[PDB]
């Protein structure tokens, strides 16, 4: 009935709790985990994960990486995460937009270095309106 | 006169400890990524070996400015690295940590691509993640085919030097050595040493069994920003490691 969940960034680990379900952002969907769930290692999109400890939700950007589980131990290392709670949803709205602009414009530009800044904003902004408002689909 | 220098030590010396979690992952799934892919033959934009006609060179300086030559020996270092690129005919773009270096190559005409604050006391995961996106952008752009850097780290137990590093494309036999060398910080006198240890790793290899939810190339693709970070990260406390040594002796040579 527990798995435990860890979020690991390069400098610290940022999550380390127990959940009875985790949401994972896979390059290829989400996945839901449940406890006892078999052995498996995926890639992390930037994106969001949810975690239920109990009967509510908490939501986690993360800024891609990987995940293993094995043995009721959830594994998940990121270059960066951000706990939901702590984003203005608001202002994540805003700053979706502006990047959202911001990369429209860079792609009627002529520089891949401006197209790929404005990329990594916009997955930024995305993954961070996602775990400030819940919802995968924007 | 005061103690708290080894406060500063100790806070360091703890965000270096909490760093190994990451590098010990990371090691224990490029292991098993390496008996599915011979990393030699992957092709993949990190891994890009172009002829190498220009070079972004990252320079880490700090802002605080008393530290004897830290900052004075890194500058000179990467001037040298610069000369020797235009003498091989090669262009190069600057991005520098540290406001004052930024000046210093300002003045004289170098071109630079990005500017940050000085290294940080305690370099952050995000601080590093900001240079990191920027260097990919650089490189991943093909805007250059080499990233290189420059920063202050010890080499000795009591002695630093600037290093010049190559930080992309991503070395595969940079990818098969784990996370070997954790280096622990201590004041013994009133210096500052390091010491560094080589540690088997504490985990265990992942399960034969084990489901890859995508191709194994596709999760390494996933993985190298992730190894980019970490080295970059590792750099900078290196880097913050050789200025509190320096501070410390600016300190007690007066």
Known sequence: MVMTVRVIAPDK????????????????????????????LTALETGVMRVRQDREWVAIALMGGFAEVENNEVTILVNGAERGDTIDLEKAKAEFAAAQAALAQAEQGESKQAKIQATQAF???????????????? | MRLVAAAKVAAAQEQVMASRPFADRLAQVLYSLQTRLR????????????????????????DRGLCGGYNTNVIRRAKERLQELEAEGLKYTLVIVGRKAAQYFQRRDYPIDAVYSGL????????????????????????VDRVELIYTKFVSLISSKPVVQTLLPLDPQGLETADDEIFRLTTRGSHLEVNREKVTSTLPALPSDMIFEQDPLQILDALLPLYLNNQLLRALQEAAASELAARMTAMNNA
């Open chain 1, 13 to 40: 680990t940022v999550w380390d709790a127990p959940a009875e379900e985790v949401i994972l952002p896979s390059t290829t969907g989400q996945l839901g985990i449940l406890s006892n769930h078999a052995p498996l």
């Open chain 2, 120 to 143: 940080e006391q305690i370099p952050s995961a995000s601080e590093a993640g900001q240079i990191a996106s920027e260097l990919l952008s650089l490189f991943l752009s093909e805007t």
């Open chain 1, 123 to 138: 997955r930024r902004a995305r993954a961070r309106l996602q775990a400030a408002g819940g919802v995968v689909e924007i």
């Open chain 2, 39 to 62: 990393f030699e033959d992957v092709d993949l934009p990190l891994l890009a070996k172009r002829p190498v006609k220009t070079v972004a060179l990252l320079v880490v300086t700090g």
